[PDB]
């Protein structure tokens, strides 16, 4: 619709450096090479499928999947809180679905 | 798995809706003339919603010119595109400064598993008999079921009439939370 | 094989005799240039006098396979290989030839994989109805000349040795003599299956002295 | 008669400052500026070219009073082929002819996001997908080479020609074309499978004895030679009364 | 939510639970971004249950396992019982009862059309032009396009158009590309005992059916067509990763002497003066050549060049496939072969198989060639500037092959044999549109009645490099940094466009007077209504594109209160 923009980026949610770089990108000013945005909502639906992996079979894939689906979701929230705090934003909270 | 993918340079921006509005209209205009989209299709109402959510003065002149220069005597499909188009132009003027709206008019489907004589398992999304609209979907969601018990539109008949109704904000007499 | 034969001097045999003197006695490197030179004369003689006419003839007018439509080709197969008098195909292999050709018409003019309209060549025992059916499903094949690939297929089917030799000459090339001369004896006993039922097209073996 | 038809039919505007060469060209066949539906753009994917060419077409249409809300549909065929330089406009012309004869208008499938600057040009639309229209009456081809070479050609749907001839002449033509088409398909498929579409001519249609006699008679025409079946100049049809 | 366990969704619903489509579930989640839920979330955390009452089905895993078992078991039984009842029937009633039920499939073969223009019935076509048009036009001054062709990165005009309009090949388009690229060849004779008529793999000589061509070659076809990484084998081993230059050094230490003929020796001597020493070896009569201290010497070195992608004619394309003989191929610049093929394919698209047929209707002085090039035979130019310098074997007559007018010359000397005009424009990227302006004016002047028009250009190393230094072309290393694949590096009118993509090939149209086209009964693909060129203005940038061509729309508007009676076709017909 009118006023709508879509930005597509490559992104491994499994990587800490990509999580920090992406939120830094969104929040950096256009001069510094960012979008100079300020998120109103985050919807972290990234997942990798795990079929047939019971307790005895938990290994590398599972520990990795767990990093995408919990640890880096907390890091992504953390980064948004650090960027908002840095620019002194106390009245525009980002809804996390 | 922890190998970086993100770089600022690979970011692809999409913001040229002013252009895409005019191509969306033209595609609709011709899909109706070539009788790919009929007056009974929900795909016509979905495209109207998407054209109205990109309404500006450029797009209105575009639609005016195309519809006003349609020769309706060239067949039924030309009369149809003219009738709809005239409506769609009126909707687009009433919403020129309104905010664009997420509004789905897709037919709510439900699951159907069939096993034939030979025993081939076929899954299909069939239409739900009671729910043919998202308003009805919310009613059905609000009523729940026995298990959860603890102790007028013109869709699928005349898409031009349903288009006419799009910019009208339906006032709610009594809310679905009371039911 | 170049063996003398006594035949009744019909128009067909007199042609055969003439071609033995002028065309079939030439060396192989001068055969092809001579067939190009005399092409029109050869065709006019075949269509008038001989038992095996020039296949590519539409309503009396000499063509080539390459200047015939797929409709023209199927109707000319039926005209030459199917006997109106007995309402039957003079030979089953001739029907199988004509069916193989109509399946190739379907292949060439169909856009997607489909079911053949000629399911069994038993359907060809009313050939006019079967031709209408194929050329109504694929009406382009009424107006398009043969693909060059389908000419080569048609000539390949004419050389098939598990079928009765075709009752026509489809092309003028090095193999003209084999096309002209093979399977030349039966026509005298089956005049119904010859262009006008005309005995004068046919070879009839007979002795000069026993003729008295 | 021809000069009368040139003065009134073809060249009625060559000395009329009130008619644009572009307007006249269409008006010849009773088409208006609004009937120029597609513009094959040079569209090289450079910053300078793509704004310049949009600006130019836009200013042309604005001056000739093209109806508001009737943009020309941009076609940018070089998203698929790239820029072959010399050959650029020939490819565009081939696609313009394919557009007129199909009504299909190809989209720039690499038009991810149309530059915001181009929004200002109201008389140009930049589709990203293929439109099957009900018919394109005319196409503009524009080029912009190195060394200030600008060019434009208009191509008009061929069915506006047959309005200018009688039914008898048309029907005679349609018959001749149907025959010619059939022979062409024959020639084409034969040439394809035997790798002989290209056949170099060993000899000119005249012998070196007739070369000067043919050059000097403007009514000399080749005939199908009886012996060879090849088209040649016969010495009888050179400076002949008939 | 339903996209595996879709098949039990209906079984779960039968318990009075709700399963959602993705569209319903997105609708539910977008409800959590509405203003009311947002202001709710800002007060205390919000927990939305969008579960559809599934939390009330007791022991859900076993319940869903039961549903899956009683569906798979039911299907599997019915399959096994159907297979045994089919086998029983076949045993008891034999294979002849199952012979009259079987049916024959027709697999399509590629029927490549020449896509002539459809001619309507005279009543339909008389309804689009104004009624006054009859007898108003002079058809000797109406230029029609009667045939066209190209050689380009997507093959012919037929294939290019399939890929441009539909983004994918039909069976006819796929076979045509497979023939062009030399993946398949026709065969008519004995093929491993059996006689065969049809396509064969060009390498294995195994039969290929038309239906099987897409599954077998479409990947290879799409990978080796259009805009793609430069293929060194197509460009005399040119690799833009390794671009060979030579640096000039002064020798410090005297080189090991080397053998050389006598002529090569006094050539070395003539160049270097005292800085070389040549001494006959009395035995054999060769000469020991010793470069001394201070002698100039050239050492090769490679540069990594940043343009790696081009629009190249499909890998496989060979002029032999179209019938051009080896003697012509060895004689001429590669560009000329694109022209020769485009000219015959343009003549076939016009329905003119024998070009001499034109001489049944027009004099030999009435067939023009108005086609041109930006740079002409740039491979011959490499030959005479670089390969001659490096004392490599080069044909003596390479110069004639370089000239832009040489492509037209070969067309006349191999196909047309006209004595008509010859007007070879050079217009860089506007050469084809200038060729149509020249061809139109040539015909309207009376000097010709048929003109071949069009343009052609080759892609070679030196032009690639020089377009890169002008910064005209896209830097391929930048495009890779932006995640762009080759296919998506030409993006006109886009916000991120950053230079053009070099390509090679030809394109030809046959234009002629409408009055001759009707007489000859050739197809008519369009009317050339106008063709015009324009320079721009004072300036110091030769690459700068300008608004000169705006002049085609020049028009006085000082006094426009009343319509000019000229524009009215009734008036003009009344005067005629």
Swiss-Prot record, chain A:
PTM:
4'-phosphopantetheine is transferred from CoA to a specific serine of the Acyl carrier domain by the C-terminal PPT domain. This modification is essential for activity because fatty acids are bound in thioester linkage to the sulfhydryl of the prosthetic group.
Family the entry assigns: Belongs to the thiolase-like superfamily. Fungal fatty acid synthetase subunit alpha family.
Q: How does it assemble?
A: [Alpha(6)beta(6)] hexamers of two multifunctional subunits (alpha and beta).
What additional remark is attached to this entry?
Present with 17000 molecules/cell in log phase SD medium.
* Role played: Fatty acid synthetase catalyzes the formation of long-chain fatty acids from acetyl-CoA, malonyl-CoA and NADPH. The alpha subunit contains domains for: acyl carrier protein, 3-oxoacyl-[acyl-carrier-protein] reductase, and 3-oxoacyl-[acyl-carrier-protein] synthase. This subunit coordinates the binding of the six beta subunits to the enzyme complex.
* Protein's UniProt name: Fatty acid synthase subunit alpha
Give the organism the record lists: Saccharomyces cerevisiae (strain ATCC 204508 / S288c)
**Underlying gene:** FAS2
Swiss-Prot record, chain B:
The organism's superkingdom is given as Eukaryota
- PTM statement from Swiss-Prot or TrEMBL: 4'-phosphopantetheine is transferred from CoA to a specific serine of the Acyl carrier domain by the C-terminal PPT domain. This modification is essential for activity because fatty acids are bound in thioester linkage to the sulfhydryl of the prosthetic group.
Q: Which residues carry this modification: Phosphoserine?
A: 135
Report the function annotation for this chain: Fatty acid synthetase catalyzes the formation of long-chain fatty acids from acetyl-CoA, malonyl-CoA and NADPH. The alpha subunit contains domains for: acyl carrier protein, 3-oxoacyl-[acyl-carrier-protein] reductase, and 3-oxoacyl-[acyl-carrier-protein] synthase. This subunit coordinates the binding of the six beta subunits to the enzyme complex.
Assembly and partners are described as:
[Alpha(6)beta(6)] hexamers of two multifunctional subunits (alpha and beta).
Q: What else is known?
A: Present with 17000 molecules/cell in log phase SD medium.
What family, per the record? Belongs to the thiolase-like superfamily. Fungal fatty acid synthetase subunit alpha family.
Q: What's this protein's name?
A: Fatty acid synthase subunit alpha
Q: Which organism is it from?
A: Saccharomyces cerevisiae (strain ATCC 204508 / S288c) (Baker's yeast)
Organism classification: Eukaryota, Fungi, Dikarya, Ascomycota, Saccharomycotina
UniProtKB/Swiss-Prot annotation, chain C:
The miscellaneous comment for this protein is: Present with 91800 molecules/cell in log phase SD medium.
Q: Which family does it belong to?
A: Belongs to the fungal fatty acid synthetase subunit beta family.
- Organism of origin: Saccharomyces cerevisiae (strain ATCC 204508 / S288c) (Baker's yeast)
- Assembly: [Alpha(6)beta(6)] hexamers of two multifunctional subunits (alpha and beta).
Its domain of life reads Eukaryota
The UniProt function text for this chain reads: Fatty acid synthetase catalyzes the formation of long-chain fatty acids from acetyl-CoA, malonyl-CoA and NADPH. The beta subunit contains domains for: [acyl-carrier-protein] acetyltransferase and malonyltransferase, S-acyl fatty acid synthase thioesterase, enoyl-[acyl-carrier-protein] reductase, and 3-hydroxypalmitoyl-[acyl-carrier-protein] dehydratase.
> Parent protein range shown?
850 to 1061 of 2051
Spell out the protein name for this chain: Fatty acid synthase subunit beta
């Amino acid at each position: 619709a009118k006023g709508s923009t879509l930005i597509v980026v490559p992104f491994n949610q499994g990587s800490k450096q990509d999580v920090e770089a992406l939120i830094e990108f969104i929040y950096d000013t256009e001069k510094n090479g960012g979008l100079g945005w300020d998120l109103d909502a985050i919807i972290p639906f990234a997942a990798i499928p795990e079929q047939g992996i019971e307790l005895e079979h938990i290994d590398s894939k599972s520990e990795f999947a767990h990093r995408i689906m919990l640890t880096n979701i907390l890091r992504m929230m953390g980064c948004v809180k650090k960027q908002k705090s840095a620019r002194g934003i106390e009245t525009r909270p980002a809804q996390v679905i | 798995g922890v190998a970086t993918s993100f770089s600022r340079k690979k970011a692809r921006t999409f913001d040229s809706s002013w252009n895409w509005a005019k191509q969306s209209l033209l595609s609709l205009y011709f899909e109706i003339i070539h009788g790919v989209l009929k007056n009974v299709d929900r795909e016509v109402v979905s495209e109207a919603i998407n054209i109205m959510n990109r309404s500006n003065d450029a797009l209105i002149k575009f639609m005016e010119y195309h519809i006003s220069n349609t020769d309706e005597t060239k067949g039924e499909n030309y009369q149809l595109v003219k009738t709809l188009g005239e409506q769609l132009i009126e909707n687009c003027k009433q919403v020129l400064d309104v905010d664009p709206v997420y509004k789905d008019v897709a037919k709510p489907t439900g699951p159907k598993t069939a096993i034939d004589k030979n025993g081939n398992i076929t899954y299909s999304e069939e239409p739900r008999e009671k729910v043919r609209k998202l308003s009805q979907y919310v009613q059905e969601m609000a009523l729940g079921g026995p298990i959860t018990k603890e102790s007028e539109d013109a869709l699928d008949k005349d898409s031009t009439k349903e288009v006419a109704s799009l910019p009208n904000k339906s006032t709610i007499s009594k809310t679905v939370s009371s039911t | 094989m170049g063996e003398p034969i006594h035949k009744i001097a019909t128009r067909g045999v007199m042609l055969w005799k003439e071609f033995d003197e002028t065309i079939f006695n030439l060396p192989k490197n001068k055969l092809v240039p001579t067939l190009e030179a005399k092409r029109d004369y050869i065709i006019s003689r075949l269509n008038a006098d001989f038992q095996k006419p020039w296949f590519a003839t539409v309503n009396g007018q000499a063509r080539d396979l390459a200047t015939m439509t797929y409709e023209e080709v199927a109707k000319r197969l039926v005209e030459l290989m199917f006997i109106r008098s007995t309402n039957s195909w003079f030979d089953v292999t001739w029907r199988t030839f004509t069916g193989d050709f109509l399946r190739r018409v379907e292949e060439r003019f169909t856009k997607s994989k489909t079911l053949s309209l000629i399911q069994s060549y038993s359907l060809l025992d009313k050939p006019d109805e079967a031709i209408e059916k194929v050329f109504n499903a694929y009406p382009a094949a009424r107006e398009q000349f043969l693909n060059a690939q389908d000419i080569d297929h048609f000539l390949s089917m004419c050389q098939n040795p598990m079928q009765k030799p075709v009752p026509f000459v489809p092309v003028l090339d090095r193999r003209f003599e084999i096309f002209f001369k093979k399977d030349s004896l039966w026509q005298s006993e089956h005049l119904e299956a010859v262009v006008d039922q005309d005995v004068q097209r046919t070879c009839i073996l007979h002795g000069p002295v026993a003729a008295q | 008669l021809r000069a009368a038809q040139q003065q009134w039919g073809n060249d009625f505007y060559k000395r009329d400052p009130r008619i644009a060469p572009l307007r006249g060209a269409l008006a010849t066949y009773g088409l208006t500026i609004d009937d120029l539906g597609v513009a094959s753009f040079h569209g090289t994917s450079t910053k300078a070219n793509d704004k310049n060419e949009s600006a130019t077409i836009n200013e042309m249409m604005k001056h000739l009073g093209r109806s508001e809300g009737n943009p020309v549909i941009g076609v940018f065929q070089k998203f698929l082929t790239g820029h072959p330089k010399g050959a650029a406009g020939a490819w565009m012309m081939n696609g313009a002819l394919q557009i007129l004869n199909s009504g299909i208008i190809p989209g720039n499938r690499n038009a991810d996001n149309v530059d915001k600057i181009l929004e200002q040009f109201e008389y140009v639309l930049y589709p990203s997908k293929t439109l099957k229209t009900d018919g394109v009456r005319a196409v503009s081809i524009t080029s912009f080479g190195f060394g200030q070479k600008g060019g434009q050609a208009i191509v008009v749907h061929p069915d506006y020609l047959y309005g200018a001839i009688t039914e008898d002449r048309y029907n005679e033509y349609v018959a001749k074309v149907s025959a010619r088409e059939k022979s062409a398909y024959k020639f084409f498929h034969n040439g394809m499978i035997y790798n002989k579409l290209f056949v170099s001519k060993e000899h000119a249609p005249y012998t070196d004895e007739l070369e000067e006699d043919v050059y000097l008679d403007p009514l000399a025409r080749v005939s199908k030679d009886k012996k060879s079946g090849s088209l040649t100049f016969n010495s009888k049809n050179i400076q002949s009364k008939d | 939510t339903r996209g595996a366990n879709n098949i039990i969704a209906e079984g779960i619903e039968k318990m009075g639970v709700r399963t959602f489509s993705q569209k319903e579930m997105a609708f539910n989640l977008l409800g959590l971004l509405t203003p009311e839920v947002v202001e709710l979330c800002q007060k205390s955390p919000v927990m939305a249950d969008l579960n559809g009452g599934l939390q009330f089905v007791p022991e859900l895993k076993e319940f869903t396992a039961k549903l899956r078992k009683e569906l798979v078991e039911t299907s599997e039984v019915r399959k096994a019982v159907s297979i045994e009842t089919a086998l029983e029937h076949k045993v008891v009633n034999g294979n002849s009862a199952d012979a009259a039920y079987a049916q024959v499939e027709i697999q399509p073969r590629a029927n490549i059309q020449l896509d002539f223009p459809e001619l309507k019935p005279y009543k339909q076509v008389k309804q689009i032009a104004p009624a006054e048009l009859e007898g108003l036009l002079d058809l000797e001054r109406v230029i029609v396009v009667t045939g066209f062709a190209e050689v380009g990165p997507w093959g012919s005009a037929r294939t290019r158009w399939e890929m441009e309009a539909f983004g994918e090949f039909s069976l006819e388009g796929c076979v045509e590309m497979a023939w062009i690229m030399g993946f398949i060849s026709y065969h008519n004779g004995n093929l491993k005992g059996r006689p065969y008529t049809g396509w064969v793999d060009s390498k294995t000589k195994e039969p290929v059916d038309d239906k099987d061509v897409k599954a077998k070659y479409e990947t290879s076809i799409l990978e080796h067509s259009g805009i793609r990484l430069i293929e060194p084998e197509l460009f005399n081993g040119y690799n833009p990763e390794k671009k060979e230059m030579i640096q000039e050094v002064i020798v410090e230490e005297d080189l090991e002497p080397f053998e050389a003929s006598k002529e090569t020796a006094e050539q070395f001597k003539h160049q270097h003066g005292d800085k070389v020493d040549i001494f006959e070896i009395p035995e054999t009569g060769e000469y020991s050549v010793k470069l001394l201290k201070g002698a100039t010497l050239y050492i090769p070195k490679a540069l990594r060049f940043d343009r790696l992608v081009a629009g190249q004619i499909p890998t496989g394309w060979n002029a032999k496939t179209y019938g051009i003989s080896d003697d012509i191929i060895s004689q001429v610049d590669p560009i000329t072969l694109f022209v020769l093929v485009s000219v015959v394919e343009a003549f076939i698209a016009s329905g003119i198989t024998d070009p001499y047929e034109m001489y049944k209707y027009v004099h030999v002085s009435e067939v023009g060639n108005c086609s041109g090039s930006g740079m002409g035979g740039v491979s011959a130019l490499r030959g005479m500037f670089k390969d001659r310098f490096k004392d490599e074997p080069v044909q003596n007559d390479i110069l004639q092959e370089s000239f832009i007018n040489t492509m037209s010359a070969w067309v006349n000397m191999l196909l047309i044999s006209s004595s008509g005009p010859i007007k070879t424009p050079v217009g860089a990227c506007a050469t084809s549109v200038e060729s149509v302006d020249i061809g139109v004016e040539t015909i309207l002047s009376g000097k010709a009645r048929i003109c071949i028009v069009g343009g052609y250009d080759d892609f070679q190393e030196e032009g690639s490099f020089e377009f890169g230094n002008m910064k005209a072309t896209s830097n391929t290393l930048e495009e890779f940094e932006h995640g762009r694949t080759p296919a998506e590096m030409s993006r006109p009118a886009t916000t991120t466009r950053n230079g053009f993509m070099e390509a090679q090939g030809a394109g030809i149209q046959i234009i002629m007077q409408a009055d001759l086209a009707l007489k000859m009964g050739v197809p008519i693909y369009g009317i050339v209504a106008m063709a015009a060129t324009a320079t721009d203005k004072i300036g110091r940038s030769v690459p700068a594109p300008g608004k000169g061509i705006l002049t085609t729309a020049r028009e006085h508007h000082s006094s426009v209160k009343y319509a000019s009676p000229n524009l009215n076709m009734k008036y003009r017909k009344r005067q005629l």
